[PDB]
Amino acid sequence: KQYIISEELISEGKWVKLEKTTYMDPTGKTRTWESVKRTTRKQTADGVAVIPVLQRTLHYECIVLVKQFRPPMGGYCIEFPAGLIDDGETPEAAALRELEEETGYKGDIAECSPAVCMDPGLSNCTIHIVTVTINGDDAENARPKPKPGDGEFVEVISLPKNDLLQRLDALVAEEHLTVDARVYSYALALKHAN
Amino acid sequence: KQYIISEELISEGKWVKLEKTTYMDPTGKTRTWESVKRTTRKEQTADGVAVIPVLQRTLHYECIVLVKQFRPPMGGYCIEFPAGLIDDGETPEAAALRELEEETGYKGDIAECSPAVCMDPGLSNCTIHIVTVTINGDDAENARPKPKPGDGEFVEVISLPKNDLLQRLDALVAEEHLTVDARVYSYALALKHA
Numbered sequence: 001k002q003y004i005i006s007e008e009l010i011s012e013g014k015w016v017k018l019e020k021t022t023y024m025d026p027t028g029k030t031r032t033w034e035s036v037k038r039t040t041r042k043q044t045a046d047g048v049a050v051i052p053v054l055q056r057t058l059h060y061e062c063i064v065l066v067k068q069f070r071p072p073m074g075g076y077c078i079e080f081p082a083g084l085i086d087d088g089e090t091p092e093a094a095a096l097r098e099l100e101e102e103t104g105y106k107g108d109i110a111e112c113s114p115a116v117c118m119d120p121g122l123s124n125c126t127i128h129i130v131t132v133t134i135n136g137d138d139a140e141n142a143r144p145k146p147k148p149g150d151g152e153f154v155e156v157i158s159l160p161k162n163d164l165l166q167r168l169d170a171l172v173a174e175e176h177l178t179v180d181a182r183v184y185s186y187a188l189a190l191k192h193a194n
Numbered sequence: 195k196q197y198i199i200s201e202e203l204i205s206e207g208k209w210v211k212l213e214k215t216t217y218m219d220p221t222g223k224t225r226t227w228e229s230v231k232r233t234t235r236k237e238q239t240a241d242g243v244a245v246i247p248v249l250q251r252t253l254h255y256e257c258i259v260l261v262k263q264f265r266p267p268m269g270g271y272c273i274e275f276p277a278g279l280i281d282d283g284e285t286p287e288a289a290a291l292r293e294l295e296e297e298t299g300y301k302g303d304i305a306e307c308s309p310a311v312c313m314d315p316g317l318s319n320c321t322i323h324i325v326t327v328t329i330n331g332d333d334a335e336n337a338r339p340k341p342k343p344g345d346g347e348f349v350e351v352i353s354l355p356k357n358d359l360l361q362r363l364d365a366l367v368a369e370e371h372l373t374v375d376a377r378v379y380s381y382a383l384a385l386k387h388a
């Protein structure tokens with residue numbers, strides 16, 4: 001019943017553009033929407049985000065997250081490791097790459113989502129969420145070597161999976177950080193399960 | 195270590211703007227970022243709310259109440275938690291209960307409310323509160339709930355059992371052209387991983 005008629009470019013930067021989308025509403029009346037798109041997509045999706053489950057024997061299972069300065073937020077955020085998928089890279093390969101770059105961990109793929117939307121009222125941005133396990137007892141994960149790209153500046157924060165939401169709430173209370181909505185949604189469901 | 199130096203307006207729409215952010219990197223070098231922001235945030239603790247609505251009915255498994263709508267940025271239909279922007283002077287809890295009623299018909303009860311969490315922090319400053327709400331599906335108020343959509347809102351309700359949420363979302367994605375929201379997928383994943 002609803003569909004795009006046309007798009008008008010409002011403004012294009014190097015990395016993002018602003019568009020005005022004309023669409024047909026289900027009554028048959030034409031309407032407009034201001035939308036953002038990245039300029040970088042080719043690709044199943046813009047990005048991957050990695051849910052990294054760090055498994056060490058005789059330890060709690062942890063979820064590995066990253067803290068970075070985020071210029072649109074004007075502050076530090078706690079997020080799943082993540083980045084844009086390179087042209088001709090599969091989402092799986094992007095996930096293992098980004099996790100290795102951002103955390104130094106070498107992980108194994110468990111599952112991969114379809115493309116999911118980031119903020120569909122605002123943007124067309126999509127990611128694959130990739131669940132990866134990390135065998136923390138393997139020598140290659142003993143002293144994990146994070147390889148920042150140019151201008152990345154990433155702190156690794158591992159939190160126990162069994163208490164994730166409480167630990168995130170503490171960091172927020174004590175550290176004036178912003179938690180990512182997908183991290184927080186995952187932490188919620190861990191508590192809400194059963 | 196890192197902070198904002200300046201924020202230059204590039205293009206301002208009615209609803210969204212593009213900015214050139216200048217910031218200090220942790221090597222002490224000045225850099226830039228193209229950032230997105232809404233034009234609509236005043237003194238609210240966040241742009242918006244998304245509601246995690248847990249429908250509870252005696253001798254039923256608990257459902258997560260989701261909504262499906264056309265999203266012009268995506269050029270298609272999306273399945274999301276019920277959500278909307280916080281009106282000026284409105285509390286996040288009031289916004290969540292109001293949006294839930296407007297989008298689904300249901301009258302909920304507040305369970306918990308997150309701090310402001312970031313939607314897509316590499317792209318935008320957009321934040322929400324994630325508000326968990328229980329819906330007493332045994333109350334006659336919630337028997338034959340009718341959405342009260344606003345002008346240009348056209349929302350379908352989809353309630354799926356919590357205990358099978360990921361597979362039920364996969365089956366919807368298998369059956370039509372639609373995208374699942376990354377917060378919903380995240381939450382459905384954690385329900386599986388717990």
Ligand SMILES: CCNc1ccc(C)nn1
Pocket residue numbers: 032033034035121122209210
């Ligand atoms: C980022 C949201 N953009 C919007 C919202 C409403 C309307 C009418 N147009 N554009």
Ligand SMILES: CCNc1ccc(C)nn1
Pocket residue numbers: 015016226227228229316317
């Ligand atoms: C929406 C992403 N904006 C960006 C990304 C990278 C750089 C250097 N600048 N701006």
Ligand SMILES: [Cl-]
Pocket residue numbers: 053110131133387
């Ligand atoms: Cl897992």
Ligand SMILES: [Mg+2]
Pocket residue numbers: 081082083102
């Ligand atoms: Mg990244």
Ligand SMILES: [Mg+2]
Pocket residue numbers: 083098101102148149152
């Ligand atoms: Mg990286």
Ligand SMILES: [Mg+2]
Pocket residue numbers: 276277278297
């Ligand atoms: Mg809405």
Ligand SMILES: [Mg+2]
Pocket residue numbers: 277278293296297347
């Ligand atoms: Mg609404």
